[PDB]
Ligand binder design. Structure first.
Ligand code: FAD
Ligand code: FAD
Ligand code: YJK
Ligand code: YJK
Lengths: 490, 488
């Protein structure tokens, strides 16, 4: 009972990547696996738990919460199709939303509890995972390396999968701001909220707050640069800015908070770099996420971190110490659950199966649950324009007929296909509007199969759908030649 | 009379496609005949085809409206609060808004004719007079006033389909989907008759807009609705229509209908069951619209089924006469008809002979909740392949544990030739299914194997990613015979 335990693989982080690897090594290959996490259930104080950032304070609750936010649009848009009810009685109870999310998230926590009790050679250890040596993980009561040892775990192989954490800027009064972590637990919806960042978390939470805000509430999103959502298609960036604007979100571009102080009433006084001021009840920082490397004591074994602070890996998830691997947000690349999952599965097939495999980081389909949402896979046209001599862009944009009736004329569906015009290969596909995230998944499979634009236009539409726009573009709307935009070819 | 390269009888999905490509792509002279310039009684179809006027478009809009019965109830779960007892569904408003949407489309097709060189719209009833002449008359009666005689080097038959009405006493007291679109009042009790997608769709529509104590019944003559769709999906959407308060009578078929003193209809079934309803909507089938064409004047061969016979290039037995869309009784979908029109016109005026592929067409049923499907159901596939595998995923979505629509099970199924892992068919029931399936259509045109699905990186969180997370077959067919494990 006072003895070290010995394992084929120790995984630090029972999240998206770590649980895929752990489960696969144990049930596909009969390896003996230990999995360390700091908490068995979602919430304060450590927020991520068993199941990772995605289950506890990420993809899962944010989706249930955006689902809730969509009803403000449904209730309003119902009028146009003939629905009548007292508009004046309509109230949004945040406490019911939060309590329902809390139950859904705890159920997944509990299902995970049972997986670990039941499955041979897959064990759960509660605490903070640190590297003592090439073959020993120590599990401490806290992230403080001086805290009590609960366990020592011998591992032939060690998987680093501790994920990421919110980045807080060093500004005066930062202690009066929150991250996405605390947002999930606010006991009441803020009347006034600044969400700081042009990234998918700022935009997603702005929509949530915008819908659950009490009477006379206001949601402000601020971003240091000119146009939110860097990395996504410029048409889609511009349009989702109009659509957030049209739903009563104030977008402050080229603005950045310099300091936060309390007003005498407990509210927050934000001073921007520009000298502008805003009073809010909540300042949610969402300016980025950083690899959680601190607490691992990587120094003890000399695991190399990148310039940026991520664990350096090759294509096979291998650090500079052989037998020590890193996957998911700790590698500080694409910060997505299914990428974490694919990397973990590829790592286990390589180390423990004998089917070596490297995750493909290109043509990865992803979504933004803005209202309305983004669906995207592959290159945006300006990235394409720098790698291929001739890029074609197929664009279709329209107001869905249903929104001529709903009264939401402002909800432009946008569908964009980017091709290598030399040979028709689809490089990239971008969608804005309802069902964009469900449309784009299958588009992922197409691109992995090197679909050309003719493979798309030769497929017969399903009518009536938004999706059918993708099988209806025969003529490029414009081109890039040698990196330069033009309606026509010379 | 006037001179044309192409006369198109019918200005619908396939006819307008064919007409538009002939004029704007090949510089041909084109006459198109339809019987009405905009939607609704007396002829229901018009400029646009059945889809635009009394089919895909209005029905989608009206299903969109019916969905708000689920949205309003399901919002409680996410903490939305309002006086439920003040909730009322105004059908008149829905119809008026549908009507405006359809009229603006009819007007934009007028627009297109006025502005398109070599493309002419003629109002009236087309029929063949001889091999090279289309007559347009005042009405369907082949002895009404000639309006136009059109000399044509090529003639395209594109008159579409009509609701099949069975030969039973009191069939006059029944409506079709055409009249459903124009009901002045939402029926309190209604009987949709038929297991196909039109009966199911309308059942959903009426269920939402029904006045206070109303009731939607759907009856089908055989034991399970929606023949031709995956059997699991067929069983599940049955469960889910019942759950939302729609009575499904299986193995029941109307024997007659009579008038009640209050203007309601008394339906007697073959079993001798009886049901009093405000409306009986017949949706047992659709048949090629071939009567008014006078096909005998030239001897265009019909199939036993009633549809105009064509080869794979939509050519009839008469040299310069072609048929596309519903009139050929192949797949009765708009994009299939558009794809035949385009294909015919390239063949005849483009010397690039193209045939339309009728395999692995994606289709949708706009049930609540909706179906999305492409390619073979496992039963058809078991008759064509030694080793078929079926991968199955079925769950209540987390959002329906919260809304309280616990009954809304999502179903994803992939059918494969297990010999090589080739994806034969994909079948979805759940929110987004019709959106999910479109690109699956592109996938089946790229010889996607099951492993191509499960090696694609998921988009999380979605229903769609369930397609890319199935690696172990649930069960198999070996020489036609369902079994859980392989014999080895
Ligand atoms: C608000 C938000 C929304 C998101 N939405 C989406 C989305 O919709 N779709 C999507 O694809 N991605 C989304 N993401 C990103 C997604 O959550 C991550 O990419 C994914 O969770 C990363 O998985 P991972 O395996 O790298 O680590 P994680 O899932 O983060 O798991 C790491 C685990 O390690 C634990 N841990 C850390 N240090 C230690 C230690 N020393 N010892 C023990 N345990 C430790 C943590 O408690 C955590 O449980 C979202 C992220 C956030 C913050
Ligand atoms: C209620 C309903 C819902 C449907 N929903 C969908 C759906 O969601 N998706 C889908 O893909 N398909 C759907 N369909 C099927 C779709 O409507 C048809 O497959 C499609 O419209 C067929 O086009 P077509 O060119 O064959 O004929 P049509 O589109 O019907 O065009 C035929 C035209 O010919 C005209 N005409 C007829 N006789 C004459 C004559 N003698 N002279 C001149 N003109 C004449 C008619 O007025 C009509 O406008 C639906 C059908 C119905 C009935
Ligand atoms: O809503 C929605 N969605 C979603 C789904 C749905 C639905 C419907 C409903 F109820 C619900 C839902 C929406 C809106 C709008 C949309 C679309 N867009 C448009 O419109 N487009 C334009 C262009 N195209 C092309 C094709 C070809 C052709 C040609 C000619 C002939 C015919 C055809 C058309 C056109 C063109 C040309 C001309 Cl001239 C014409 Cl007139 C037309 C396509 C595309 O969508
Ligand atoms: O709803 C819905 N949907 C839709 C979308 C969404 C969502 C969520 C939310 F809130 C909203 C919306 C539903 C429910 C149920 C179902 C199904 N089933 C299951 O199970 N799955 C899960 C999983 N996957 C992938 C992978 C997984 C795994 C891994 C490893 C090992 C184990 C497992 C995804 C996910 C999910 C969930 C979770 Cl929690 C996770 Cl973490 C993940 C598949 C699927 O779905």
């Amino acid at each position: 009972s006072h003895m070290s335990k010995a394992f084929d693989l120790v995984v630090i982080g029972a999240g998206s990547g770590g649980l895929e690897a752990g489960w696969n090594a144990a049930t596909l290959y009969g390896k003996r696996v230990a999995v360390v996490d700091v908490q068995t259930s979602h919430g304060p104080p450590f927020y991520a738990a068993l199941g990772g950032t995605c289950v506890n304070v990420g993809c899962v609750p944010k989706k249930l919460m955006v689902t809730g936010a969509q009803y403000m649009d449904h209730l309003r848009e119902s009028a146009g199709f003939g629905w009548e009810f007292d508009g004046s009685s309509v109230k949004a109870n945040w406490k019911k939303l939060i309590a329902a999310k809390n139950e859904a998230v705890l159920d997944i926590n509990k299902s995970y509890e049972g997986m670990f009790n039941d499955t041979e050679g897959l064990d759960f250890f509660l605490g903070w995972g640190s590297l003592e040596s090439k073959n020993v993980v120590v599990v401490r009561e806290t992230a403080d390396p001086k805290s009590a040892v609960k366990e020592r775990l011998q591992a032939d192989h060690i998987l680093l999968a501790t994920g990421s954490w919110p980045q807080m800027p060093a500004i005066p009064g930062i202690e009066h701001c929150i991250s996405s972590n605390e947002a999930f637990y606010l006991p009441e919806p803020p009347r006034r909220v600044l969400t700081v960042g042009g990234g998918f978390i700022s935009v997603e939470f702005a929509g949530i707050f915008n819908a659950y805000k009490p009477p006379g509430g206001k949601v402000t999103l601020c971003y240091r640069n000119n146009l939110i959502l860097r990395g996504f298609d410029e048409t889609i960036r511009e349009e989702v800015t109009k659509q957030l604007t049209a739903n009563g979100i104030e977008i402050m571009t080229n603005e950045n908070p310099a300091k936060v102080s309390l007003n005498t009433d407990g509210s927050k006084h934000v001073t921007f770099e520009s000298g502008k001021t805003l009073d809010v009840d909540v300042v949610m920082m969402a300016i980025g996420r950083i690899p959680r490397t601190n607490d691992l004591q990587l120094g003890n074994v000399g695991v190399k971190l990148t310039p940026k602070g991520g664990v350096q890996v090759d294509e096979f998830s291998r650090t500079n110490v052989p037998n020590i691997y890193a996957i998911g947000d700790i590698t500080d690349r694409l910060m997505l659950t299914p990428v974490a999952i694919n990397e973990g599965a590829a790592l286990v097939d390589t180390v423990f199966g004998n089917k070596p495999r490297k995750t493909d980081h290109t043509r990865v389909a992803s979504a933004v649950f803005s209202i309305p949402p983004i669906g995207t896979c592959g290159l945006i046209e300006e990235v394409a324009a720098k790698e291929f001599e001739k890029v074609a862009v197929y664009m279709s944009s329209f107001t869905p007929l249903m929104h001529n009736i709903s009264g939401s004329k402002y909800k432009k569906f946008v569908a964009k296909i980017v091709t290598n015009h030399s040979d028709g290969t689809v490089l990239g596909v971008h969608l804005l509007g309802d069902g964009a995230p469900e449309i784009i998944q299958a588009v992922g499979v197409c691109l992995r199969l090197n679909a050309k634009i003719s493979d798309f236009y030769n497929t017969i539409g399903v009518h009536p759908t938004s999706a059918e726009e993708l099988c209806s573009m025969r003529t490029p709307s414009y081109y890039y030649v040698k990196g330069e935009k033009m309606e026509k070819l010379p």
